[PDB]
Design a binder for this molecule. Structure first.
Ligand SMILES: COc1ccc(CNC(=O)c2ccccc2C[NH2+]Cc2ccc3c(c2C(=O)O)OCO3)cc1
Ligand SMILES: COc1ccc(CNC(=O)c2ccccc2C[NH2+]Cc2ccc3c(c2C(=O)O)OCO3)cc1
Lengths: 149, 149
């Protein structure tokens, strides 16, 4: 479970916010793209896996699961590409709640930047730093370090 | 030391590669931009600090140190903005060698992608995963986890 991530795609302002969630910690990375394509998804995963030890990615939909470009990125970066079937129904709810939380934070910061991408990065920062007492950023580091040791 | 990062700007193919190095571990993040501007530098730091606990950034040059936009990003993200003066002469050499290493890796992957940004992200991946035996990615997580505990 330390290497397991979940992709998630949500929409705002006629743009697409692509999110990767570290399942065990709730830590996220995100980017704004014009539309979700295999190319954009592939590039995003390449970035993610250069930054964290990404063992498994549960793709967000069937198009990204199918995409040869996404498969090729997963091959390049040594990621096991998996489906995103919520065999645990709690998964849908957690992701939906996360999207609602992120959009709420974006709303709270929206007037602090012209561009949506800026507001999204502010939202990533707030989400990852929020104490719930550890933060998601603390949990991911602890989980991974424990795994290394 | 767990929170100290160094910015570094290098050039390839008429483009700019902006790098942040975690000093204690050698772990890096990087992006390709058309030109180094305070706006691009500010956005890069906002991204970095949402992902890792960035306490201090040694800026790469005086323009980024002076930049009101960079100062504002550092304010937003709770980062201490500092100069990049190599009071330790070993600093320059480490960065120089890092730039040379990165450009070597980019050359080794260059035909595996059309776009430079892709090759740069491949180089980030290879750099961070390289065992020197622990990798830079392992070292940063251990350093930060130790600090949290
Ligand atoms: C990350 O650095 C920051 C610097 C300053 C602030 C405080 N907020 C303002 O000063 C502000 C507020 C509203 C509109 C425009 C602005 C000025 N522009 C901020 C900005 C900077 C870099 C970028 C951007 C934007 C953007 O407006 O989207 O887009 C990609 O790179 C936040 C973040
Ligand atoms: C990250 O996913 C990967 C998928 C596949 C491969 C293996 N290499 C090739 O198939 C290849 C080789 C040479 C030229 C063009 C290509 C095909 N395009 C690769 C590509 C994908 C996503 C992107 C890109 C690019 C790019 O070419 O720069 O730019 C931003 O998003 C590597 C990484």
């Amino acid at each position: 479970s330390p290497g397991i991530w979940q992709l998630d795609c949500t929409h705002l302002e006629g743009k697409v916010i692509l999110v990767a969630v570290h399942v065990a910690s709730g830590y996220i990375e995100a980017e704004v793209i014009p539309a979700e394509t295999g190319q954009e998804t592939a590039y995003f995963l390449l970035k993610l896996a250069g930054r964290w030890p990404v063992k498994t990615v549960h793709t967000d939909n069937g198009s990204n699961f199918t995409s040869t470009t996404v498969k090729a990125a997963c091959w390049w970066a040594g990621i096991k590409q998996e489906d995103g079937i919520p065999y645990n129904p709690q998964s849908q709810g957690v992701i939906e709640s996360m999207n609602k939380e992120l959009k709420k934070i974006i709303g709270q910061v929206r007037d602090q930047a012209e561009h949506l991408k800026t507001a999204v990065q502010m939202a990533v920062f707030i989400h990852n730093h929020k104490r719930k007492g550890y933060s998601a950023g603390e949990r991911i580091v602890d989980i991974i370090a424990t795994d290394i040791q």
